[PDB]
């Protein structure tokens, strides 16, 4: 169990590791939406952890990772500025930005197709009305609280 909870790297948001399983913990934030299986894990910005509550709208909760209604699992998070962020700056974390519609609960998608903001085929090449859907984060240690990356490991019973 511990070998899945905490490791040396984490997956980006649009491709969240649906990792399988088959005297409190020293993590400051802890909240359960059921009683006091599949464990997922990814990295999201500090202020945007709230959207991973059961049933809320936003930018990540409905376009990248969506919990179901009447949720039957807990959520965990803890600040991870030190390990992730660096003075040089890292850019290997992506989140989907332009998507046609919402996401069904516990649905994920991996794809790189240009979003057609208007009415133009674009021949698959980015242009005025065609955009790349995935845009990356930017991390640096000397940022305000909320912009720092947070590691999230949701438990779904």
């Amino acid at each position, epitope marked *: 169990f511990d070998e899945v909870f905490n490791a040396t790297r984490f997956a980006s948001v649009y491709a969240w590791n649906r990792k399988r399983i088959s005297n409190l913990a020293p993590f400051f934030t802890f909240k359960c939406y059921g009683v006091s299986v599949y464990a997922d894990s990814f990295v999201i910005r500090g202020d945007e952890v709230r959207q991973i509550a059961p049933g809320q*709208t*936003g*930018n990540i909760a*409905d*376009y990248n990772y969506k919990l179901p209604d009447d949720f039957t699992g807990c959520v965990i998070a803890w600040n991870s500025n030190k390990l992730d962020s660096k003075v040089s700056g890292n850019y290997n974390y992506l989140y989907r*930005l*332009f*998507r*046609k*519609s*919402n996401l069904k609960p516990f649905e994920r998608d991996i794809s790189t197709e240009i*979003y*057609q*903001a*208007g*009415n133009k085929p674009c021949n698959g090449v980015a242009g*005025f*009305n065609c*955009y790349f859907p995935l*845009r990356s984060y*930017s991390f*640096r240690p*000397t*940022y*305000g609280v909320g*912009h720092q990356p947070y590691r999230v490991v949701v438990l779904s019973f």
Partner: single-chain antibody
């Protein structure tokens, strides 16, 4: 051609209410982000609403509730309905799309007024310079957000504002080479080599914010 054409107006009493309509051509309004920017006389711009594709709605705290933003897929327009308009709510309302990373309010409507019965600062102030020399405009933020967020605007007297640079380093399309902006961290500097009021924009937070602006 692509443009936002807006049709509304009037002078309604504190009890009353009216409807604001904005129509778009060249792109389906049910595809990209849409918002509504409000400018009051003598004050900088302010954010009022965002609609995402998929129907999620967001509102400013000052106008939390009491408004409603609805889009009509069939007619390819954008609708805003104001209910229970208070006193001292008069201002010109702008219709503008949103890209938020590749662009910041790329194309704007002509702007129509409705009449009723992270804080940024602008260091340069009302800086006046003779023609033929370079000018430096400095914008200072609070939380020291990432370098790829702030964008700069130009607004001639009584017209829709336009964007110059969206990523603080990449000029917009159809922009002369004489405009350049730089700076990372807590300060952002833009320089020229056309008199207007130049604003600082920043996304990355729920409420957004605009600078007070400077008079050239």
């Amino acid at each position: 051609e692509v443009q936002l054409l807006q049709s509304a107006g009037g002078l309604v009493q504190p009890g009353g209410s009216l409807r604001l309509s904005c129509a778009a051509s060249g792109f389906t309004v049910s595809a990209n982000y849409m918002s509504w920017v409000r400018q009051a006389p003598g004050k900088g711009l302010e954010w009022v609403s965002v609609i995402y594709p998929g129907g999620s709605t967001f509102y400013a705290d000052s106008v939390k509730g009491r408004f409603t933003i609805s889009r009509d897929n069939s007619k390819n327009t954008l609708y805003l309905q104001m209910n229970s308009l208070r006193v001292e709510d008069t201002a010109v309302y702008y219709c503008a799309r949103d890209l938020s990373v590749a662009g910041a309010f790329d194309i704007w409507g002509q702007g129509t007024l409705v009449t009723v019965s992270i804080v940024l600062t602008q260091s340069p102030g009302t800086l006046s310079l003779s023609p033929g020399e370079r000018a430096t405009l400095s914008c200072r933020a609070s939380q020291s957000v990432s370098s790829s967020y702030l964008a700069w605007y130009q607004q001639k007297p009584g017209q829709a504002p336009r964007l110059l640079i969206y990523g603080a380093s990449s000029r917009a399309t159809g922009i002369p080479d004489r405009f350049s902006g730089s700076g990372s961290g807590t300060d952002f500097t833009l320089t020229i080599s056309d008199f207007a009021v130049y604003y600082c924009q920043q996304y990355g937070s729920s409420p957004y914010t605009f600078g007070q602006g400077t008079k050239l």
